[PDB]
């Protein structure tokens, strides 16, 4: 397991647009295109995204290639953030990933924002901090996909995706 086949697993694989667990218009492999409520303005995102006029539509190969740049992007915005940066250097390979995929679900701002979490994940208190992390909006609104991300950061094993 890597976190390639991790976010597969929690974001699946979707050729044409659809709209995502919070509403909004995405493609691929949980690729966000706006939060606009506008469908045009989505395909306007994705044509620009993939260089050619899609109408609505991707190939699995570019869906992929969105995947690599988004997986890629969730990353160096982990790095390049002040409160992340510490925490994923401070953590395992395995934990890592949990951390890249909830900035993928959530955000580099958003997850940068678990303040009170991200400490006890520093202080590797792997028990309490999945506590903490089950006390947010992320954990009520998509419980499964959380509860699979807090497995992965209290046992730094891949048992809840194997
Ligand atoms: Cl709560
Ligand atoms: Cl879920
Ligand atoms: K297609
Ligand atoms: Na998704």
């Not at 740049?69 to 395992?92: C, E, F, H, M, T």
Request: charged share 25%; hydrophobic share 40%; with cysteine.
């Amino acid at each position: 397991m890597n976190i390639f086949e991790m976010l597969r697993i929690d974001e699946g694989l979707r050729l044409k647009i659809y709209k995502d667990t919070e509403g909004y218009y995405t493609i691929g492999i949980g690729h966000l295109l706006t939060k606009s409520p506008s469908l045009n303005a989505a395909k306007s995102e994705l044509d620009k995204a993939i260089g050619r006029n899609c109408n609505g539509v991707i190939t699995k190969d570019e869906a992929e290639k969105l995947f690599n740049q988004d997986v890629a992007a969730a990353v160096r915005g982990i790095l390049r953030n002040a409160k992340l940066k510490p925490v994923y250097d401070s953590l395992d390979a395995v934990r890592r990933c949990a951390l890249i995929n909830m900035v993928f679900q959530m955000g580099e701002t958003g997850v940068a924002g678990f303040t009170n979490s991200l400490r006890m994940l520093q202080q590797k208190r792997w028990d309490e901090a999945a506590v903490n992390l089950a006390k947010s909006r992320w954990y009520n609104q998509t419980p499964n996909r959380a509860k699979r991300v807090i497995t992965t950061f209290r046992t730094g094993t891949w048992d809840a995706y194997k």
